[PDB]
């Protein structure tokens, strides 16, 4: 609902969305190969599932 | 230290780490195989990106 939307927010005004009550499923969306870009800090991106 | 023994101007390229592997090590084992790491779902069959 959020990231399939067409506006995108100024960086100076970014838009900030709050996520919880819910379950998240981050190996899917690594899986998929649409994204150019992908790095984390603090975690590696397999083990977030 | 070691910092007028190994340093050098440039750095040390001979010098590796393994920062992936598919599974934990075992105490006293090594391991020189240098297969590509199949970070994401997709198979790779040894070509790297």
């Known amino acids: 609902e959020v990231f399939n939307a067409t506006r995108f927010a100024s960086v100076y005004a970014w838009n900030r969305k709050r996520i919880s009550n819910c379950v998240a499923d981050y190996s899917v969306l690594y899986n998929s190969a649409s994204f150019s870009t992908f790095k984390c800090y603090g975690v590696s991106p397999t083990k977030l599932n | ?49």
Request: glycine share 10%; net charge positive.
């Open chain 2, 1 to 49: 230290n070691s910092n007028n023994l190994d340093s050098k101007v440039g750095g040390n390229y001979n010098y590796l780490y393994r920062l992936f592997r598919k599974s934990n090590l075992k105490p006293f084992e090594r391991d020189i195989s240098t297969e590509i790491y199949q970070a994401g779902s997709t198979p790779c069959n040894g070509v790297e990106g």
